[PDB]
């Protein structure tokens, strides 16, 4: 199965 779309963008890595 295809991975589901996100609800919202993940945040970038902190450092």
């Amino acid at each position: 199965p295809p991975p589901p779309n996100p609800n919202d963008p993940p945040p970038p890595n902190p450092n």
């Epitope: 779309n5 996100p6 609800n7 919202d8 963008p9």
Partner: antibody, heavy 111, light 113 residues
Framework: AYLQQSGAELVRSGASVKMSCKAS????????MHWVKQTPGQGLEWIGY????????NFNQKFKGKATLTADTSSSTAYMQISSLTSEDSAVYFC?????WGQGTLVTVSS | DVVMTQTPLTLSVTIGQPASISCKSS???????????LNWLLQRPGQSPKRLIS???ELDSGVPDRFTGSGSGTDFTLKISRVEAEDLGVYYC?????????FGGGTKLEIKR
């Protein structure tokens, strides 16, 4: 394709409550894990999320001082703690991530 | 905060009838990566919510093709071509573009029989 939340809880005013959300059937670290409060009149209110991939959290400013969000990548389990519970904190709390929602955890603040 | 306004508050429909739900945001939901993070949920009575559509128009696995999502910018629509019995409950939109994340007020769909 599934989020399983922990059981209902009775908690005293001023104490804290911790609930869990165990994930399966999708890459746990690839999606923001959201927590949502459902009010008695069908309203849905976002508390915040944690991205289990790097631990970054973002909060609704209303819950910032009392909700703590964590994630255990080894067990694919997210957690929310809510401290200093008051009467208005009695609600059903959902976790949501990717295409899935948990069944909800019913919290009752009562002495 | 970005406000999500859903209309109507209640849909009373018969089996086979088309249905339409409007969701308007107070600001654009276009994000800087070019995507628009608008999601649609159904919470059937006595059930946990279930996501039907994400990214405005993309149906989740298992969702029947009688559901369609459309719109852009601030104005979004979920349409049911022919309502079936199991489509009842409360529909919510919610946006993943702005902080805080925010939900529509909900649309109750009920069946006339």
């Amino acid at each position: 394709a599934y989020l399983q939340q922990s059981g209902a809880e009775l908690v005293r005013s001023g104490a804290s409550v911790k609930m869990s959300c165990k994930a399966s059937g999708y890459t746990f670290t690839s999606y923001n894990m959201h927590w949502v409060k459902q009010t008695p009149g069908q309203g849905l209110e976002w508390i915040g999320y944690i991205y289990p991939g790097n631990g970054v959290t973002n909060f609704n400013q209303k819950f910032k001082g009392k909700a703590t969000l964590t994630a255990d990548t080894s067990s694919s389990t997210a957690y929310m703690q809510i401290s200093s519970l008051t009467s208005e904190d009695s609600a059903v709390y959902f976790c949501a991530s990717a295409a899935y929602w948990g069944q909800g955890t019913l919290v009752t603040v009562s002495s | 905060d970005v406000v999500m306004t859903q209309t109507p508050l209640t849909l009373s429909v018969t089996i086979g009838q088309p249905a339409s739900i409007s969701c308007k945001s107070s600001q654009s939901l276009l994000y800087s990566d070019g995507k628009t993070y608008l999601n649609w949920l159904l919470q059937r009575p006595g059930q946990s919510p279930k996501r039907l559509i994400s990214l405005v128009s993309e149906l989740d696995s298992g969702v029947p093709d009688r559901f369609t999502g459309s719109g852009s910018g601030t104005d979004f629509t979920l349409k049911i071509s022919r309502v079936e019995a199991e489509d009842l409950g409360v529909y919510y939109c919610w946006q993943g573009t702005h902080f805080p994340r925010t939900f529509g007020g909900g649309t109750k769909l009920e069946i006339k029989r």
